[PDB]
Amino acid sequence: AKMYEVVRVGELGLIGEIIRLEGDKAVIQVYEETAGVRPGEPVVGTGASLSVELGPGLLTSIYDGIQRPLEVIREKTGDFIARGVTAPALPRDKKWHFIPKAKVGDKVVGGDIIGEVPETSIIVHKIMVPPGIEGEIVEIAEEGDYTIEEVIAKVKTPSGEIKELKMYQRWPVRVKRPYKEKLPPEVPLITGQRVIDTFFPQAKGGTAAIPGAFGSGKTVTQHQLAKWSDAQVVIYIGCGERGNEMTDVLEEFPKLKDPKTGKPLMERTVLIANTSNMPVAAREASIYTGITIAEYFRDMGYDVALMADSTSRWAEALREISGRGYPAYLASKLAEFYERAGRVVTLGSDYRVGSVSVIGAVSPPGGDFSEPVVQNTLRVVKVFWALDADLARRRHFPAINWLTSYSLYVDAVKDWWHKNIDPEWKAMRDKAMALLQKESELQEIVRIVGPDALPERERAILLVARMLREDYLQQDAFDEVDTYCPPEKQVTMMRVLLNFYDKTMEAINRGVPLEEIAKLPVREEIGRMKFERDVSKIRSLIDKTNEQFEELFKKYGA
Numbered sequence: 116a117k118m119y120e121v122v123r124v125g126e127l128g129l130i131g132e133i134i135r136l137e138g139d140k141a142v143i144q145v146y147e148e149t150a151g152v153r154p155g156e157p158v159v160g161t162g163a164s165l166s167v168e169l170g171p172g173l174l175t176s177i178y179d180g181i182q183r184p185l186e187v188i189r190e191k192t193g194d195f196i197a198r199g200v201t202a203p204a205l206p207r208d209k210k211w212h213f214i215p216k217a218k219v220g221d222k223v224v225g226g227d228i229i230g231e232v233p234e235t236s237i238i239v240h241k242i243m244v245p246p247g248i249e250g251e252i253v254e255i256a257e258e259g260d261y262t263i264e265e266v267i268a269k270v271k272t273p274s275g276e277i278k279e280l281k282m283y284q285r286w287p288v289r290v291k292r293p294y295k296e297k298l299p300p301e302v303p304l305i306t307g308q309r310v311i312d313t314f315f316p317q318a319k320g321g322t323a324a325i326p327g328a329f330g331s332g333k334t335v336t337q338h339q340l341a342k343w344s345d346a347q348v349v350i351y352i353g354c355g356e357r358g359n360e361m362t363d364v365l366e367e368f369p370k371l372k373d374p375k376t377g378k379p380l381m382e383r384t385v386l387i388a389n390t391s392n393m394p395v396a397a398r399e400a401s402i403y404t405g406i407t408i409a410e411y412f413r414d415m416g417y418d419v420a421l422m423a424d425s426t427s428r429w430a431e432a433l434r435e436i437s438g439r440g441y442p443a444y445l446a447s448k449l450a451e452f453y454e455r456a457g458r459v460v461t462l463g464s465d466y467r468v469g470s471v472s473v474i475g476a477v478s479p480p481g482g483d484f485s486e487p488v489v490q491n492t493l494r495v496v497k498v499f500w501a502l503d504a505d506l507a508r509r510r511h512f513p514a515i516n517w518l519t520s521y522s523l524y525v526d527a528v529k530d531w532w533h534k535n536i537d538p539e540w541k542a543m544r545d546k547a548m549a550l551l552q553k554e555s556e557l558q559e560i561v562r563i564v565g566p567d568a569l570p571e572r573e574r575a576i577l578l579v580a581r582m583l584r585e586d587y588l589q590q591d592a593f594d595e596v597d598t599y600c601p602p603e604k605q606v607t608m609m610r611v612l613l614n615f616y617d618k619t620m621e622a623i624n625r626g627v628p629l630e631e632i633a634k635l636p637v638r639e640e641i642g643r644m645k646f647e648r649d650v651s652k653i654r655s656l657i658d659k660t661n662e663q664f665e666e667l668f669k670k671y672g673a
């Protein structure tokens with residue numbers, strides 16, 4: 116009997132005589148397991164690999180799990196149903212402006228950039244020698260307009276073999292794109308969101324997760340990350356977790372502006388879509404397709420952000436087996452996916468660095484986690500931003516719980532902050548975090564015994580922790596200034612707050628009543644500094660704080 120592990124649509128897991136797992140569209144099957152063409156049930160093998168096309172055409176595109184383009188059908192009750200159609204990944208009709216960057220006689224290796232194509236108004240697409248090709252450029256195209264199938268260069272290998280190069284290349288999605296070296300985490304992916312960059316930093320090339328649960332301001336946070344992180348290119352996977360998602364992706368996504376250029380965000384984005392309507396095999400393949408495309412852009416020397424929010428549609432690619440699916444293996448590959456994240460010295464003759472940072476949504480079963488998509492080789496994820504519904508209901512925005520979130524990149528990125536931005540960055544965050552932890556402990560004790568017997572010193576810690584939460588952790592994504600917080604602004608707002616802490620504890624020491632400090636006028640300016648775009652005006656709050664505390668030391672014995 117045929118196990119019909121999929122409905123006859125767009126891909127299936129084929130298990131052969133002696134070799135397990137391959138895939139097709141019609142009945143002709145591209146294969147991971149090498150095979151000997153013509154097993155049981157009329158199945159004929161092919162060239163080989165499940166692969167993607169990489170060249171001009173990727174940007175602004177929407178694909179399914181195996182890089183076949185759109186085709187949509189109209190309304191319903193979800194109202195936009197989409198499916199992957201057998202057509203070409205990169206348009207064969209369009210003319211691209213090719214600019215040569217190499218010349219006849221140049222020696223080249225894989226990764227070398229031999230030309231450039233302005234693909235969109237945002238991104239210059241770098242044309243690269245495919246991995247494993249090297250030798251002498253014996254022929255190269257003149258500046259001009261060409262379709263993707265046109266040969267733009269010829270390379271003679273050391274054998275004398277002549278290789279024909281196009282503006283695009285193919286790569287098997289299940290094989291990591293090669294590079295020279297994976298560099299240790301070091302440079303932060305700057306999100307411009309205070310709580311993240313300060314307390315739970317992402318490294319360029321790092322791995323982060325958020326809860327996939329709707330609400331808590333997830334789509335706001337995902338939108339903020341996609342548009343503000345200092346990655347040049349975004350690869351987004353999902354689009355199918357709710358009924359209306361595809362609808363919003365077709366109507367609204369072309370409207371979104373890259374705030375850094377004023378141009379459409381789609382002009383540095385590639386979308387991969389996973390839906391209930393699509394074959395279970397394509398959705399399994401989707402993450403590999405996405406990360407291969409991400410790697411391909413890092414190879415050019417770009418920082419890229421691979422963002423996935425498709426847990427339920429991806430996870431429901433769960434399937435029946437009989438024979439042996441695979442116990443200590445179902446999370447071993449998810450590991451190999453996350454393992455493909457990294458900042459690397461890329462292939463090429465020039466020293467060149469690119470990265471893929473991964474931000475993935477994680478949804479166990481519903482609310483509380485157990486074992487589903489949670490805690491196998493968990494330490495594969497180094498950052499967790501714990502979007503928290505309770506915080507959302509208290510209207511604390513970005514609803515990131517600062518007690519259950521973590522980052523293992525704090526020490527990895529501190530040196531970049533110390534030498535480029537502020538020598539005290541790490542000392543200041545640790546100090547602020549200790550205050551938040553103390554506040555939490557105090558709030559729990561108070562819950563029990565009441566707030567009435569609180570000494571001044573503890574009331575002061577509570578006052579300043581509250582200022583940290585309101586003036587620093589809370590950030591307004593909808594505000595034209597506070598939508599992004601530059602690194603220099605982040606450290607300056609922190610110094611203002613921590614200097615206010617220092618002066619508060621000092622004042623209390625010299626017998627200044629806390630009610631006097633709570634009403635210090637500068638406090639309300641500290642409450643609004645996130646809205647101030649001029650960082651020098653924010654810095655001037657340090658002296659203004661100092662001065663006002665002086666007038667307090669005067670109104671008292673000091």
